[PDB]
DNA sequence: GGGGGAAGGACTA
DNA sequence: TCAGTAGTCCTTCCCCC
């Protein structure tokens, strides 16, 4: 198999640059303003001029401003990036019917039946980059290898605005030399459990007793890592279908007062129903983020679709279940719909 | 023994 | 006054065949 992975460069910030070119060359920071106070919230992403200085996705907006007080701070306009993303995905469909859209800014193409070798895949990759640049003026990074995991890794190594092929020989070198923390799906917590087992490279998972590996990181991740280490990882490129749609909002102030929380919960339901658009969910979950940032949730599944009115009344019962079963105050409240008809 | 669901947890956004 | 904001898949514990 030959997989071609496309990951758009600093996506949210780049789309803003495309819509307002005077922004180019300046540090741009796209933010999610929570509304609790002046500048409360987090950075969604920043272009490379801002990232060079430590302003990156996830940090508080107040911290970003301490580092770069004169950078351009823009409010996230998700719907705008979504429309731009959808047009780029449509361009990629022209290069392969076998495409897997993994997120708002990334897709995997199985080009096995389109090119004969890596030389040709690499060329098709250039063709793709040029096409996206021509049509939307957006630069992307392309990663090419024998499977999804290594195609993604290839891209990670070449961004931004890059293109890289990890051939079979390099795949073998990487299995031995690549820091296992850099493997998709290995976060800080798993990375720490592995370091604690002596495991720092994929190749290391082949010599550890399987039960020891599994007992520590679970059966699924152990098999995943082993399959990659044996160079036998095979997952087909598959059309993704959204399985849930939801919205969670931050409250002006923490609380466990039902009438005070209702307005935020109802606003989350409205926005959520706006996004479902024709999709009818049979399940609804109320999700609360507690004062200490823990996540607690309660849901219900119906043998039929959930009308907006039913979503309103059931969400309150589920919220009450959360209040009655957890004594912490709530900071964020939202809903999540799933099991679509 | 293991299918199947609810809720927590990890990961990547 | 650090802490957003969406969404997926796996795990653990429980019911049930
Ligand atoms: N914690 C995060 C991480 C990402 N995103 C959003 C904004 C990013 O623009 C977009 C894509 O994610 P990437 O990790 O690919 O980040 P970028 O495209 O921004 O940059 P790059 O790919 O250059 O590294 O997803 C977000 O809202 N919150
Ligand atoms: Ca990406
Ligand atoms: Ca990207």
Q: Is A238 inside any structural domain?
A: no
Burial of A9 (0-12, 13-18, 19+ CB in 10 A): middle
Strand partners, A46: A29
Residue A215's region, left for phi above 0, alpha for psi from -120 to 50, else beta, is: alpha
Cβ contact A166:A154 at 8 Å: yes
Q: For residue A267, give both structure tokens.
A: 């606003």
Residue A281 lies in a domain: yes
- CA A184/CA A231 separation, integer angstroms: 15
Solving technique? X-ray
Which residues does residue A227 pair with via DSSP β-bridges, in sequence order? none
In a domain, residue A125? The reply is yes
For chain A, first and last CA: distance in Å? 34
Choose among A17, A4, A206, A23: nearest CA to A121.
Answer: A4
Q: Which of A31, A45, A139 to mutate to test the pocket of ligand 1 (most atoms within 8 A of CB)?
A: A45
Structure tokens at A301: 């599944």
Residue A277 included in any domain: yes
Domain that holds residue A174: 167-233
DSSP codes of every residue in A143-170: EEESSHHHHHHHHHHH-SS-EEE--HHH
CA distances from A208 to A133, A172, A186, A202, A224 (A): 47, 19, 18, 11, 14
User: In terms of domains, do A6 and A113 share one?
Assistant: yes
Note the Cα A209 to chain centre separation in Å: 32
Of residues A115, A109, A105, the one with CA closest to residue A136: A105
- Check whether residue A299 has its CB closer than 7 Å to nucleic acid strand B: yes
Q: Are residues A91 and A159 in the same domain?
A: yes
Q: Is A338 exposed, middle or buried (0-12, 13-18, 19+ CB in 10 A)?
A: middle
- Helix (H) or strand (E) holding A93, with range, is none
* Lookup result for tokens 């959930």: A306
User: Are the C-beta atoms of residues A333 and A265 closer than 8 Å to each other?
Assistant: yes
Distance, CA of A178 to CA of A184 (rounded, Å): 12
Residue A325 shares a structural domain with residue A259: yes
Q: Are A109 and A98 in contact (CB under 8 A)?
A: yes
Q: Which value, in Å, is the radius of gyration of the alpha carbons in chain A? A: 23
Residues 76-115 of A with CB under 7 A from strand C: 76
Both A6 and A147 in one domain: the answer is yes
Distance CA A122, CA A140 (A): 14
User: Do residues A136 and A84 make contact, with C-beta atoms less than 8 angstroms apart?
Assistant: yes
DSSP codes of every residue in A245-306: EEEEEEEEEEE--HHHHHHHHHHHHHHHHHHHTT--EEEEEEEEEETTS-EEEEEEE-SS--
A96 and A156 part of one domain: yes
In a domain, A221, yes or no: yes
Q: Is A5 in the pocket of ligand 1 (CB under 6 A)?
A: no
What is the DSSP track for A33-47?
A: E-SSSTT-EEEEEE-
CATH number of the domain encompassing residue A184:
1.10.150.20
Tokens for A241, please give them: 């279908």
Residue A149 near residue A236 (C-beta atoms within 8 A): no
Query: Which single residue is written with the structure tokens 């109320």?
Result: A286
Which residue numbers of A belong to the known binding site for Mg(2+)? Answer: 7, 105
Q: How far apart are CA A40 and CA A31, in angstroms?
A: 10
CA–CA gap between residue A234 and residue A148 (Å, rounded): 8
Q: Are A319 and A339 in contact (CB under 8 A)?
A: no
Same domain for A146 and A177, yes or no, is no
What token pair was written down for A198?
């002596």
Q: Which one, of A302, A245, A248, lies nearest residue A278 by Cα?
A: A245
Of the candidates A27, A49, A77, which is a domain's last residue? Answer: A77
Three-state secondary-structure class, residue A135:
helix
Beta carbon of A136 within 6 Å of any ligand 1 atom? no
Domain match, A142 and A17 both: no
Assess whether A162 and A96 both reside in one domain. Answer: yes
> Is the separation of the CB atoms in A47 and A161 below 8 Å?
no
What is the nearest nucleotide to A224, using C1' and CA? Answer: C10
- Backbone φ, ψ for residue A227 (5° rounding): -55, -40
**Cα–Cα distance measured from residue A14 to residue A49, given in angstroms and rounded to the nearest whole number:** 12
CA distance A56 to A158: 18
Ligand 1 lined by A73 (C-beta under 6 Å): no
Nearest residue (CA) to C1' of B9? A295
Task: Tell me the CB-side half-sphere exposure of residue A40, using CA atoms within 13 A.
Answer: 9
Dihedral pair phi/psi, residue A284, rounded to 5°: -135, 140
Cα gap A144→A7, rounded to integer Å: 12
- Write down which residue in A182, A212, A233 finishes a domain: A233
Name the resolution in angstroms: 2.1
Crossing angle of helices A168-177 and A148-158, rounded to 10°: 80
Q: Is the residue at A54 inside a domain?
A: yes
What would the two tokens of residue A31 be? 């933010």
Parallel, antiparallel, or unpaired: how do β-strands A163-165 and A140-145 relate?
parallel
Three-class SS state of A7: strand
Total residue length of chain A: 341
* Cβ count within 10 A of residue A42: 17
Which of A123, A145, A166 is where one domain is finished?
A166
The CATH number covering residue A293 comes to 3.30.1490.100
Torsion angle defined by CA atoms of residues A8, A181, A56 and A65, in that order, rounded to the nearest 10 degrees: 180
CA–CA dist A15, A138 (Å, integer): 7
Do both A6 and A112 map to the same domain? yes
Q: Is A156 in the pocket of ligand 1 (CB under 6 A)?
A: no
Same domain, A205 and A109: no
CATH value at residue A51: 3.40.1170.60
d(CA A9, CA A215): 38
Phi, psi of A187 (to 5 degrees): -95, -170
Task: Calculate the alpha carbon distances from A54 to A51, A58, A65, A68, A157 in Å.
Answer: 5, 11, 11, 9, 19
Length A307 CA → C15 C1' (Å): 29
Residue A51 three-state SS: helix
Q: For residue A150, what are the contacts with CB-CB under 8 A and spacing of at least 6?
A: A3, A143, A166, A171, A174
- Tell me if A292 is assigned to some domain: yes
Edge to edge, the sheet with strand A3-8 lists A99-103, A106-110, A3-8, A140-145, A163-165
Q: Are residues A6 and A139 in the same domain?
A: yes
Q: How many domains does chain A have?
A: 4
Q: Are residues A201 and A309 in the same domain?
A: no
Is residue A239 one of the residues assigned to a domain? no
CATH number at residue A148: 3.30.70.270
């Amino acid at each position: 198999m030959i997989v071609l992975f496309v990951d758009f460069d600093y996506f949210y910030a780049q789309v803003e640059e495309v819509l307002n070119p005077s922004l180019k060359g300046k540090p741009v920071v796209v933010c999610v303003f929570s509304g609790r106070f002046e500048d409360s919230g987090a950075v969604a992403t920043a272009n490379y001029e801002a990232r060079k200085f430590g302003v990156k996705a996830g940090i508080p907006i107040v911290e970003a401003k301490k580092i770069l007080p004169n950078a351009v701070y823009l409010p996230m306009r998700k719907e705008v990036y979504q429309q731009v993303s959808s047009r780029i995905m449509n361009l990629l469909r022209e290069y392969s019917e076998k495409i897997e859209i993994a997120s708002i800014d990334e897709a995997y193409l199985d080009i096995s039946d389109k090119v004969r070798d890596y030389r040709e895949a690499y060329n098709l990759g250039l063709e793709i980059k040029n096409k996206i640049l021509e049509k939307e003026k957006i630069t992307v990074t392309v990663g090419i290898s024998k499977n999804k995991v290594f195609a993604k890794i290839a891209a990670d190594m070449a961004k931004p605005n890059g293109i890289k092929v990890i051939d079979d020989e390099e795949v073998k070198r990487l299995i031995r030399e690549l820091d296992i923390a850099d493997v998709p799906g290995i976060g800080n917590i798993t990375a720490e459990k592995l370091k604690k087992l002596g495991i720092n490279k994929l190749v290391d998972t082949l010599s550890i007793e399987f039960d020891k590996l599994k007992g520590m990181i679970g059966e699924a991740k152990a098999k995943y890592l082993i399959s990659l280490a044996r160079d036998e990882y095979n997952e087909p490129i598959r059309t993704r279908v959204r399985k849930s749609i939801g919205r969670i909002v931050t409250m002006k102030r923490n609380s466990r007062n039902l009438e005070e929380i209702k307005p935020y919960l109802f606003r989350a339901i409205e926005e959520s129903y706006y996004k479902l658009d024709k999709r009818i969910p049979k399940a609804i979950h109320v999700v609360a983020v507690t004062e200490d940032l823990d996540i607690v949730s309660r849901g219900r599944t119906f043998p039929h679709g959930i009308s907006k009115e039913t979503a309103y009344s059931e969400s309150v019962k589920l919220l009450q279940k959360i209040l009655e079963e957890d004594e912490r105050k709530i900071r964020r409240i939202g809903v999540r719909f799933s099991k679509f008809i």
